[PDB]
Design a protein around this ligand. Structure first.
Ligand SMILES: [Mg+2]
Lengths: 160, 158
């Protein structure tokens, strides 16, 4: 025994086919027989189900990582999980396959953009003569001092 | 901006004229350095938390927990500098409902059928059934099981 599309095989009796629960709800109890309803309860706050199903629990909403500078794009609803991301002018730096931190795309004031900021990489910015790139900005050489790793960048230029 | 630091150091939150060495991954910021030539007070992350990079976070990140109801299994446990890695069992594929949420499904074996593409890490086997069989419930079902309303009559004709 198999079931028609949209139905599932009863866990305790394989000769019974039950209709799946609508997204936004979860399986409270399997249907008791052919032509009888599957009992589906609405997901509690903080949980959801995005497709027709027969799960015994709704999924807990995903949480965004505030420490990584993440913001909530969309809030979690009974049939829609939380959507986490970054601001429009920010890019993502993945520390791992699914762990990303939001970083500001360099505006490159007093510099030349050689490659626009991308989804996963910062703007490629070349600061103009008299400035050096640090802390995502083009900083004036008048602030350069020993140990700031700027001495050579600030010395007269050389065509090497 | 005028006050900056060497790569590897961060600007002291109370005085931008002071730069402090960052904490290595696996540790977090206990206390900022008091000034030049003195250490930043960084301490190891406690049980269940981690930091994946050089930082100066006041708290470590909480490790992720694999979703058992989605049939997920732990591929790598969480360490002081690396979050837990979740996956599926052998002969199963991951169906991603979103970028960071996936469900484990069994790959179709395609018995009594033709495999066009083998099962992949994120998608099922592409299978079509031989004459006398019909695809349903991840398998090629014998047409002897075809019954009206099971949507298979025409597929089961000679
Ligand atoms: Mg910096």
């Amino acid at each position: 025994s198999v079931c028609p599309q949209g139905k599932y095989i009863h866990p305790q009796n394989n000769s019974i086919c039950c209709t799946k629960c609508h997204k936004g709800t979860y399986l409270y109890n399997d249907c008791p027989g052919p032509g009888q309803d599957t009992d589906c309860r609405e997901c509690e706050s903080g949980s959801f189900t995005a497709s027709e199903n027969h799960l015994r629990h709704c999924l807990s909403c995903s949480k965004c990582r505030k420490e990584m500078g993440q913001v909530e794009i969309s809030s979690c609803t009974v049939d829609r999980d939380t959507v986490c991301g970054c601001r429009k002018n920010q890019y993502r730096h993945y520390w791992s396959e699914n762990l990303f931190q939001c970083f500001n795309c360099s505006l490159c004031l007093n510099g030349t953009v050689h490659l626009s900021c991308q989804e996963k990489q910062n703007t490629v910015c070349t600061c103009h003569a008299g400035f050096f790139l640090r802390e995502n900005e083009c900083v004036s050489c008048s602030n350069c001092k020993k140990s700031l790793e700027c001495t050579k960048l600030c010395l007269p230029q050389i065509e090497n």
